Design a protein around this nucleic acid. Structure first.
Ligand SMILES: [Mg+2]
Ligand SMILES: [Mg+2]
Ligand SMILES: [Mg+2]
Ligand SMILES: [Mg+2]
Ligand SMILES: [Mg+2]
Ligand SMILES: [Mg+2]
Ligand SMILES: [Mg+2]
Ligand SMILES: [Mg+2]
Ligand SMILES: [Mg+2]
Ligand SMILES: [Mg+2]
Ligand SMILES: [Mg+2]
Ligand SMILES: [Mg+2]
Ligand SMILES: [Mg+2]
Ligand SMILES: [Mg+2]
Ligand SMILES: [Mg+2]
Ligand SMILES: [Mg+2]
Ligand SMILES: [Mg+2]
Ligand SMILES: [Mg+2]
Ligand SMILES: [Mg+2]
Ligand SMILES: [Mg+2]
Ligand SMILES: [Mg+2]
Ligand SMILES: [Mg+2]
Ligand SMILES: [Mg+2]
Ligand SMILES: [Mg+2]
Ligand SMILES: [Mg+2]
Ligand SMILES: [Mg+2]
Ligand SMILES: [Mg+2]
Ligand SMILES: [Mg+2]
Ligand SMILES: [Mg+2]
Ligand SMILES: [Mg+2]
Ligand SMILES: [Mg+2]
Lengths: 53, 180, 52, 348, 222, 118, 125, 147
RNA sequence: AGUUCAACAGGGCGUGAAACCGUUAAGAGGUAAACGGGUGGGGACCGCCCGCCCGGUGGAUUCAGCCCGGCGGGGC
RNA sequence: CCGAGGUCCGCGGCGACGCCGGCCUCCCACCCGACCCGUCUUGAAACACGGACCAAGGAGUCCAACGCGCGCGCGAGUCAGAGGGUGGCUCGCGAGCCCCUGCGGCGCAAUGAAGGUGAGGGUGGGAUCCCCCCGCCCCGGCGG
RNA sequence: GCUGCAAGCCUCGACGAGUAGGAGGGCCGCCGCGGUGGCGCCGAAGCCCAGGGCGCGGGCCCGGGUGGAGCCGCCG
C-alpha cells in the first residue's frame, strides 16, 4: 500500500526518447508530438515543438 | 446442489434455561464462565442441568442421597444435585451429609443441619470448588414419574405391562374383553 | 374421533346445559348478605348468643 | 439474607428521631419478578366484572334460507315484506345485524386462583424490591432526595387528621417530588376508555403502610398518587403496580416493627400467619464479580484468550512465491535450480 | 521471574521452529528426488525388458482421482449411497481413492456418475496447493500454513504440505487419515467443455475410467 | 448486588427507551446513556455522574459515596470543576485513575466532560 | 455535522416488493402479501413474475437503518430525549416527532445545535 | 390468552392448518365414542383392552364408608409420633416403649413394607398383616388390636 | 355583500376516504390493457476543514508548578 | 517485500443551480421476460367453478374434562372449597388479607369377580468424581 | 481506544426449492387494561400528497396539505 511517490514506473518499449507520439485527449488531440523524457510520476515530458504544432 | 439432508441440522438441545428465574440465570451466567475457562468436566454437566426442565431435574430424596454417599470412597465428598432435595420420612439416620442443591425442603434442611451437615448453594460450590473437585454429582429418578407407566408399546398388546388411560380404577373400567 | 392413546372421555354435555348454568358471581355478595344477617340477628337477640 | 442493617426512624421533619429498627428479613427475601408478574397477572384478573353479549342477539329473526335456484347466496334471509329488512342475511356472523361468531358468554373463567404461598412469595419479593434504591428509582419514583430508601417515620404520623399535616410531612421527607410527578402526569386517557368511566389517568405516588389507623388514611386521602395500606393487609396490586416491583413505600414505625412477625425471619417463623416462613435463596452470594475474581476461582480458569483469529485469506501457492515457500521451503531451491536450467552453461 | 522463563521459552520455540523449518526442507528435497528415482526406475525396467525382447508390465496404479460429473437429482439409491461414501455429494468435486478391489468395485457401481483416472504427481501437487482444504474440526480450512497439517496429521508424521502430497501420490500406511483430512476438492467446470456427459469415456463420452487422461481433465477443472 | 439488580431492570425500567432499533437509559448517573450493566448509573456502589453546572460554565462531577448506599439524600458528592479543558480533564482523570474509583469508566467520563464543555 | 464514518451503502434492491395483482385491483393494496395459491405464478416464482422478498435481500449489518447521510435515525419528543444522543452523536441523528408543537420544536433544534447533534427535520415548521 | 395462540399465525393460510384435500368438517368419523366396535375398534383394542363387556358381581347400594380401610406401612409408622419421641425411647430400650395408636392418626390396617428401627413399640391398629406383626414382634413390641 | 377562528361549517350542514365522474395541466396511443427485469428521456416537487499534539507569530490573560489555610472524598 | 485480503505521503474539470444531484416512485419509450386470480384436482390460462367495481363487516372461539410438554409454588405431601373472620358507616375493594381442630380431592399400595390378603439386591455399560505413579512447571497447573 | 443491552458482542466453517403440515422470531399491525415515559388549539385523531427516507418483508418515520380535540412510545 505504498504511496504513489514510491510506486514503480512502467513505460512501454515503444516509447523511447525521441519517438513521435500522438496525443489522443486534451485540446491537442491527434497532434503528433515528440517524446523527450519520462518524469518521476510516470507522466511523459512531451514537446511539440511549439514552433511546429 | 449438494446431496445432503437438512433434516437433522437443528440439534434440539436446550442452550439456555427456559425459566425467567433471576437467581437461576445468575447461576447460568456463573457456570457459563466456568464451562469456558475452567476446563473442568464437572462444570459442563452442571451447565446442562441448569438449563433442564423440572421433569429432567426430578426430586432427590434424602434416603437416596444417603445411599449414594455411603458407597466406598465417598467419605468426605460433597453431594451435588441440580434440583431439590426432598425429605424421606422412611429413613431414620442422617450421617452428617454435605449437600449442594438448588432447593432443599424445610424438613430436609432441618434434618441435614441437625445432623451436623452443611447445605450449600451453587454459587458457594463455584466459590469453594470451581473445578468441581471432591463432588459426587447425583440425580433423581427421572423415570420415576407417573407418565412413564403409560409409556410403552400399548396397553392392548401382549407383554405390555403398560398402564392404560382410565378415568377410574374399578371393576367395570377396562377389564372385560382383552384382559382375560 | 380417537387419535392416539388417551382416556375414553364422557362429557355430560348432550342436554341443553346452556339453559341451566349458574355462575357464582354473587358468591362474595352472599357473603356480605349472610354476614349482615348474622349482625342483624345479633342485635335482635342482643344478650343471647348469635350462634343459637 | 444476613445483610440486615439498622434502619433509622425519621421524625415529622426530614431528620432522624434517634430511633433505629433492625431491617426486617422480608426485605432480604428473593426478588422474583417472574413470580410477581405471574401473581399480579392473575390477582388483577379477579376484580374484573363479567361482560357478555345478549343471548338473543341476531336470533330475533324468523329467517329461512331461500336455497338454490336463485342468484342469492344460500344464506338465511329475513321473511318477505314491504321493508328493507326483507331478503337480508340474518343469522350468520358475516351478515349485518346477525349473531357474532362465538358470542361472548358470561360464564368464562374471569377469576384465577393463585397458591397462597405464591401470593406471599410475590409479596416478599415486592417488599424486598422497595428496599433497593435501584428498583425504586427504576420503577419511576422520584426518591433522589428522601433521607433513606426504606423510609420509616414516627408513629405520630398515624395520628394525623388533616391534609396540611400530611402534605408538610411529605415535603420534609423530600418525597413531594414523587407527588409533583403525579400532577405532571394527570392527563386524559387515550381511546374509548373515557366513555367507560376511565376518563382521567395519572401516576402512582408513594405508598404509605401504617399499623394503627388513627386518621392517617383520611389525612393522606386527598393527595393524588398516595396509596394507604394496613401492614397486615398488603395488596400486591398496589405494592407492585403494573406487575413491576419497586414501589416507593413510606413505612411507619409501628408497621415496620410488626413487619418482622407478619412474615417471620428464616430463623423464627411468622407468628401472624399459620405455618409460613420466608422463601429460601437458591443463591447466597449474588455478586458474580466477587465469585469470579475470588482467589479460588482465578486459580481454576485459564488465562483469557484475546487473540481474534481472522480468516486467513488463501493465496495461490502455485502463482504466489512467498506463500509457496511458506508451505514448501524447498520450493525456493527447486525454483533456483530450474531457473538456472534455462541458462546455457557449458559443463566439462 | 515469570518474564525470564517465558522469554527463555519464546527463544526456545523460535529455535525449535527453525529446525522444523529445516526438517521439512530436507524432507521435501528427499521427496522430490524420490519422484525422480521412481520415474527413472520404471524407464530402466521397461528398457531392459525390450532389449531382451520381453515386455515390462508396470505395477497397476494404486491411486485414483474421482470426479463426480453428473448432478444430484434423479440418482439411483445404490449409486447415491456410493457417491456419499466417496465424499462426492455435488457435481465437479474430486477425491483421491486408494485403488483396491473393494474400491474399484465401488467405482464400477457408480460409473455413470463419475469420471476417474490415475493422477500424476502434478495433479496431486496442484490440487492440494490450489484446491487444498483441510478438515480441522469438521470445517473446511484452507491449507495456508503447515501448522494446520501438523496439528491434525502430526501423529502420522505428516507435518508439512509436501508430506500430505507424498503420502497421497505414493500411498502409505497413513493414506486414509491423510486423504480423509482433505476436504473434497471443489473443482470448477471443465474449461473447454466435455465430449458428452451421459456416456462412457471409451464410447466417446467422459464417464468411467480414463487411465492417464484424467490429468487433462484436472488441468482444465483445477 | 448489582448483578442481581441488573436482571430486574435490564428490560423493565422507567429510564429505558426502546425505539428505532436502539436502546437508551436516562438515569442521571449514566455516562453514555447506554443500557448496559457497565454504564447503568443507579445499580452499583460506585457511580460516576458528569453533568453541566447550574450555569453554562463548568462541570459538576457526581461520585457515589461509600456510606451513602441506602440514603439518597446523602449518597452523592457534587464536585464542580469550572476550569479550562485540560485542567478539567486532568481533574476527572485523577479522580478515576489515582483513586481507583470506577476505572472502567475512565475514558467514557473523559469524553463526556469533553462533550459538555462544547 | 459529519458522521463518524460514511461508508458506501450498498442496497441489494431499491424497488418495493409490490403485492401480486395489486395493479389490477384497487381493493388489493401494494402491501406485500405472500401468495399462497395452489397455481400462483408468483408463489412458484415463474420467470418474469413479481419477485418475493426473502432474507437474501437483507442489507449489510453495518449499514442497516443507516440514512443516506450516514447517521441512524432516532425519534425524539423533547429536549430530554435529545440529550441521550449527546454521546454517540457521530453515529445517530435526532428526528423531532411529527406531533410536537412548533413552540417545542424550536427548543430541540437549539439544544441539538449545542450538543452537536444533527436533526433531520430542523426547519419543520 | 389469545396472543400466543396458533390461530394468530394461521392468518393468510387458506385451510387454517387442516389440509386442502381432507378439509376440516363436522365429525368425519362419528361423535364421541362412536364406532368403538366397528371402525374405531383398532384404537379401542390397542389402547383400552377390556373396554367392552361385563366382569364381576354387582353391588347395588355400595357405601364407601363400609369398605373404608386406610392402610399404612411400617416405614412410615414412626411418622405418627414426633422425632424426639422416637429418639428419647431409643436411649431407654429396657421396657419403656412408646405407643403408636394408628387408629387416632387416620389409618386402620398396618402393612409390613419397610424396615422398622430397632426399638420396642406398641402398635394399636384395627388390622395387621402377618408380616407387619412379625416385624413388630421381631424388633420387639406388641401389636394391640382395637375396634 | 354580510355572519363566523372557520361557510375547506350554509340547513341529511363535523371530519369527507375508495369506487365513479367533470375539468385543467402533462404525455402517449395500428398488435386489449396492465405486469417483471434493465436502462433512457421527460416532468412535478426537492437537494447540496476538522480534531489531537507540536513549531513559531502577535494580542488578553479574578495565570500555572509549588507552598499555606479550610473542606470534601477514595481502598481485600 | 510475489509475505496475517488497499492504498496513494497521486490528480483533473465544475461547484449556487443557469450548466449540479434525486436509487425507488410519476409520465413516456425501447429490449428481454411475462396467459387470471382463488379453488377442487394426477393435471387449470382453461371451452371447470366463484369473482363488474369500491368501502365497511365477515369465519378456529368459549365452557367442561383429558393427555403430554413447559413455567411456578411447596413437597410425601399438596390444594383450603363450601364457608367463616375483618382496615367497620362497606372508593379503589364484589379485590386483597386472614383461619378452616384440612371436610374432602388427588397422591403415599397394590391385587382379586369377590370373600379377602397385602410388597427385601446382583451383573454389564455409565456423565461426573476419587486415588496412585512418572515427567514438566510461570507453583496454577499441564502431559503421560 | 472501542464493547460487556452476557437474552450482548466477536470469530470460523458449511448450508439455503417447497404444496398439505409443523415450529420459531417479529422494535409487524389493531382494540382495551395495569404500569411507566410523553405529546397536543404555536393544532390531536383521521384523511390526502409528482416531497425526504428506513426495513428482506409485515410495516414505519419525517415533510407538506386538509382537519379541529384528543393521542402515542416502552414493560406487562
Ligand atoms: Mg382423529
Ligand atoms: Mg346471474
Ligand atoms: Mg347485532
Ligand atoms: Mg383511537
Ligand atoms: Mg436427469
Ligand atoms: Mg438418463
Ligand atoms: Mg426498499
Ligand atoms: Mg392496488
Ligand atoms: Mg399445482
Ligand atoms: Mg403453508
Ligand atoms: Mg378448504
Ligand atoms: Mg393442523
Ligand atoms: Mg380423500
Ligand atoms: Mg371437531
Ligand atoms: Mg376548519
Ligand atoms: Mg368544517
Ligand atoms: Mg361535510
Ligand atoms: Mg381528475
Ligand atoms: Mg389532454
Ligand atoms: Mg420519491
Ligand atoms: Mg373449488
Ligand atoms: Mg378431473
Ligand atoms: Mg379447452
Ligand atoms: Mg359469474
Ligand atoms: Mg375489513
Ligand atoms: Mg392425545
Ligand atoms: Mg389431604
Ligand atoms: Mg375423585
Ligand atoms: Mg426453505
Ligand atoms: Mg373489541
Ligand atoms: Mg399516487
Amino acid at each position: 500500500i505504498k504511496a504513489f511517490s514510491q510506486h514503480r514506473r512502467k513505460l512501454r518499449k515503444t516509447i523511447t526518447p525521441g519517438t513521435v507520439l500522438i496525443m489522443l485527449t486534451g485540446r491537442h488531440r491527434g497532434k503528433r508530438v515528440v517524446f523527450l523524457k519520462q518524469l518521476d510520476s510516470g507522466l511523459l515530458l512531451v514537446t511539440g515543438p511549439l514552433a511546429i504544432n | 446442489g449438494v446431496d445432503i439432508r437438512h433434516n437433522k441440522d437443528r440439534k434440539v438441545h436446550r442452550k439456555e434455561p427456559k425459566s425467567q428465574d433471576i437467581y437461576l440465570r445468575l447461576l447460568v451466567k456463573l457456570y457459563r464462565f466456568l464451562s469456558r475457562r475452567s476446563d473442568a468436566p464437572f462444570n459442563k454437566v452442571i451447565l446442562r442441568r441448569l438449563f433442564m426442565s423440572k421433569t429432567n431435574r426430578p426430586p432427590l430424596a434424602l434416603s437416596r442421597l444417603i445411599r449414594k454417599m455411603k458407597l466406598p470412597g465417598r467419605e468426605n465428598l460433597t453431594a451435588v444435585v441440580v434440583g431439590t432435595i426432598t425429605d424421606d420420612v422412611r429413613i431414620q439416620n442422617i450421617p452428617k451429609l454435605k449437600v449442594c442443591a438448588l432447593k432443599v425442603t424445610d424438613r430436609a434442611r432441618s434434618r441435614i443441619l441437625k445432623a451436623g451437615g452443611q447445605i450449600m448453594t451453587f454459587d458457594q460450590l463455584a466459590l469453594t470448588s470451581p473445578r468441581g473437585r471432591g463432588t459426587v454429582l447425583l440425580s433423581g429418578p427421572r423415570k420415576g414419574r407417573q407418565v412413564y407407566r403409560h409409556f410403552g408399546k400399548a396397553p392392548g398388546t401382549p407383554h405390555s405391562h403398560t398402564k392404560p388411560y382410565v378415568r377410574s380404577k374399578g371393576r367395570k373400567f377396562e377389564r372385560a374383553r382383552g384382559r382375560r | 374421533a380417537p387419535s392416539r392413546n388417551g382416556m375414553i372421555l364422557n362429557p355430560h354435555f348432550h342436554k341443553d346445559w346452556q339453559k341451566r348454568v349458574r355462575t357464582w358471581f354473587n358468591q362474595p355478595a352472599r357473603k356480605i348478605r349472610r354476614r349482615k344477617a348474622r349482625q342483624a340477628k345479633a342485635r335482635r337477640i342482643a344478650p343471647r348468643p348469635v350462634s343459637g | 439474607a444476613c445483610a440486615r442493617p439498622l434502619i433509622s426512624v425519621y421524625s415529622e421533619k426530614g431528620e432522624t428521631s434517634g430511633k433505629n429498627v433492625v431491617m426486617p428479613a422480608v426485605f432480604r427475601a428473593p426478588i422474583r419478578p417472574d413470580i410477581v408478574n405471574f401473581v399480579h397477572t392473575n390477582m388483577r384478573k379477579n376484580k374484573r366484572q363479567p361482560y357478555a353479549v345478549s343471548e338473543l342477539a341476531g336470533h330475533q329473526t324468523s329467517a329461512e334460507s331461500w336455497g338454490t335456484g336463485r342468484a342469492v347466496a344460500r344464506i338465511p334471509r329475513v321473511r318477505g315484506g314491504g321493508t328493507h329488512r326483507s331478503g337480508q342475511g340474518a343469522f350468520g356472523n358475516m351478515c349485518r345485524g346477525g349473531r357474532m361468531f362465538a358470542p361472548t358468554k358470561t360464564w368464562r373463567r374471569w377469576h384465577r386462583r393463585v397458591n397462597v404461598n405464591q401470593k406471599r412469595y410475590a409479596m416478599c419479593s415486592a417488599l424486598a424490591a422497595s428496599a433497593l434504591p435501584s428498583l425504586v428509582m427504576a420503577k419511576g419514583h422520584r426518591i433522589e432526595e428522601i433521607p433513606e430508601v426504606p423510609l420509616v417515620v414516627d408513629d405520630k404520623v398515624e395520628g394525623y387528621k388533616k391534609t396540611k399535616e400530611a402534605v408538610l410531612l411529605l415535603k420534609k421527607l423530600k418525597a413531594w417530588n414523587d407527588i409533583k410527578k403525579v400532577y405532571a402526569s394527570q392527563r386524559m386517557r387515550a381511546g374509548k376508555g373515557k366513555m367507560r368511566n376511565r376518563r382521567r389517568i395519572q401516576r402512582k405516588g408513594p405508598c404509605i403502610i401504617y399499623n394503627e389507623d388513627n386518621g392517617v388514611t383520611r389525612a393522606f386521602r386527598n393527595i393524588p398518587g398516595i396509596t394507604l395500606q394496613s401492614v397486615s393487609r398488603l395488596d400486591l396490586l398496589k405494592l407492585a403496580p403494573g406487575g413491576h416491583i419497586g414501589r416507593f413505600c413510606i413505612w411507619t414505625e409501628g408497621a415496620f416493627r410488626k413487619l418482622d412477625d407478619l412474615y417471620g425471619t428464616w430463623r423464627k417463623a411468622s407468628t401472624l400467619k399459620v405455618d409460613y416462613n420466608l422463601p429460601m435463596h437458591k443463591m447466597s452470594i449474588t455478586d458474580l464479580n466477587r465469585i469470579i475474581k475470588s482467589e479460588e476461582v482465578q486459580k481454576a480458569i485459564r488465562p483469557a484468550n484475546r487473540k481474534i483469529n481472522r480468516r486467513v485469506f488463501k493465496k495461490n501457492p502455485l502463482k504466489n512465491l512467498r506463500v509457496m515457500m511458506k508451505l514448501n521451503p524447498y520450493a525456493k531451491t527447486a525454483r533456483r535450480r530450474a531457473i538456472m536450467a534455462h541458462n546455457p552453461d557449458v559443463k566439462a | 521471574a515469570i518474564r525470564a522463563v517465558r522469554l527463555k521459552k519464546a527463544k526456545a520455540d523460535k529455535k525449535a521452529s527453525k529446525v522444523t523449518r529445516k526438517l521439512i526442507f530436507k524432507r521435501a528435497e528427499a521427496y522430490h528426488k524420490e519422484y525422480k528415482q521412481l520415474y527413472r526406475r520404471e524407464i530402466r525396467m521397461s528398457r531392459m525388458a525390450r532389449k531382451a525382447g520381453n515386455y515390462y508390465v508396470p505395477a497397476e496404479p494404486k491411486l485414483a482421482f474421482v470426479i463426480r460429473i453428473r448432478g444430484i437429482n434423479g440418482v439411483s439409491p445404490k449409486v447415491r449411497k456410493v457417491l456419499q461414501l466417496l465424499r462426492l455429494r455435488q457435481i465437479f468435486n474430486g477425491v483421491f481413492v486408494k485403488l483396491n478391489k473393494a474400491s474399484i468395485n465401488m467405482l464400477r457401481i457408480a460409473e455413470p456418475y463419475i469420471a476417474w483416472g490415475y493422477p500424476n504427481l502434478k495433479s496431486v501437487r496442484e490440487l492440494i496447493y490450489k484446491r487444498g482444504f483441510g478438515k480441522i474440526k469438521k470445517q473446511r480450512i484452507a491449507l495456508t500454513d503447515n501448522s494446520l497439517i501438523e496439528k491434525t496429521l502430526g501423529q502420522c508424521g505428516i507435518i508439512c504440505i509436501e508430506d500430505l502430497i507424498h503420502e497421497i501420490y505414493t500411498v502409505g500406511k497413513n493414506f486414509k487419515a491423510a486423504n480423509n483430512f482433505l476436504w473434497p476438492f471443489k473443482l470448477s467446470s471443465p474449461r473447454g467443455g466435455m465430449n458428452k456427459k451421459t456416456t462412457h469415456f471409451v464410447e466417446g463420452g467422459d464417464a468411467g475410467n480414463r487411465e492417464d487422461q484424467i490429468n487433462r481433465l484436472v488441468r482444465r477443472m483445477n | 448486588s448489582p448483578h442481581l439488580q441488573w436482571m430486574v431492570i435490564r428490560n423493565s425500567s422507567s429510564f429505558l427507551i426502546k425505539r428505532n432499533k436502539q436502546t437508551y437509559s436516562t438515569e442521571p448517573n449514566n455516562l453514555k446513556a447506554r443500557n448496559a450493566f457497565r454504564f447503568n448509573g443507579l445499580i452499583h456502589r460506585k457511580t460516576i455522574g458528569i453533568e453541566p453546572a447550574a450555569d453554562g460554565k463548568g462541570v459538576v462531577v457526581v461520585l457515589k459515596k461509600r456510606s451513602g448506599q441506602r440514603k439518597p439524600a446523602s449518597s452523592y458528592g457534587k464536585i464542580t470543576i469550572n476550569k479550562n479543558s485540560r485542567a478539567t480533564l486532568a481533574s476527572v482523570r485523577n479522580i478515576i485513575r489515582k483513586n481507583k474509583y470506577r476505572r472502567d469508566l475512565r475514558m467514557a467520563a473523559l469524553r463526556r466532560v469533553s462533550a459538555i464543555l462544547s | 455535522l459529519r458522521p463518524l464514518t460514511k461508508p458506501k451503502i450498498v442496497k441489494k434492491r431499491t424497488k418495493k416488493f409490490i403485492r401480486h395483482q395489486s395493479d389490477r385491483y384497487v381493493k388489493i393494496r401494494a402491501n406485500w402479501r405472500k401468495p399462497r395459491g395452489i397455481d400462483n405464478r408468483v408463489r412458484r416464482r415463474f420467470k418474469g413474475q413479481m419477485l418475493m422478498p426473502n432474507i437474501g435481500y437483507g442489507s449489510n449489518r453495518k449499514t442497516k437503518h443507516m440514512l443516506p447521510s450516514g447517521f441512524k435515525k432516532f425519534l425524539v419528543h423533547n429536549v430530554k430525549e435529545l440529550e441521550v444522543l449527546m454521546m454517540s452523536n457521530k453515529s445517530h441523528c435526532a428526528e423531532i416527532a411529527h406531533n410536537v408543537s412548533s413552540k417545542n420544536r424550536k427548543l430541540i433544534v437549539e439544544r441539538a445545535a449545542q450538543l452537536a447533534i444533527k436533526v433531520t427535520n430542523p426547519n419543520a415548521r | 390468552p389469545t396472543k400466543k395462540s396458533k390461530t394468530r399465525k394461521l392468518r393468510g393460510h387458506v385451510s387454517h392448518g387442516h389440509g386442502r384435500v381432507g378439509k376440516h368438517r363436522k365429525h368425519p368419523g362419528g361423535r364421541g365414542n362412536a364406532g368403538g366396535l366397528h371402525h374405531h375398534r383398532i384404537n379401542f383394542d390397542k389402547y383400552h383392552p377390556g373396554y367392552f363387556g361385563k366382569v364381576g358381581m354387582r353391588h347395588y347400594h355400595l357405601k364407601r364408608n363400609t369398605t373404608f380401610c386406610p392402610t399404612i406401612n411400617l416405614d412410615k409408622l414412626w411418622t405418627l409420633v414426633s422425632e424426639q419421641t422416637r429418639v428419647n425411647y431409643s436411649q431407654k430400650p429396657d421396657g419403656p416403649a412408646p405407643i403408636i395408636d394408628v387408629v387416632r392418626a387416620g389409618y386402620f390396617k398396618v402393612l409390613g413394607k419397610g424396615k422398622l428401627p430397632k426399638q420396642p413399640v406398641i402398635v394399636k391398629a384395627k388390622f395387621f398383616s402377618r408380616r407387619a406383626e412379625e416385624k413388630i414382634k421381631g424388633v420387639g413390641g406388641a401389636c394391640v388390636l382395637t375396634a
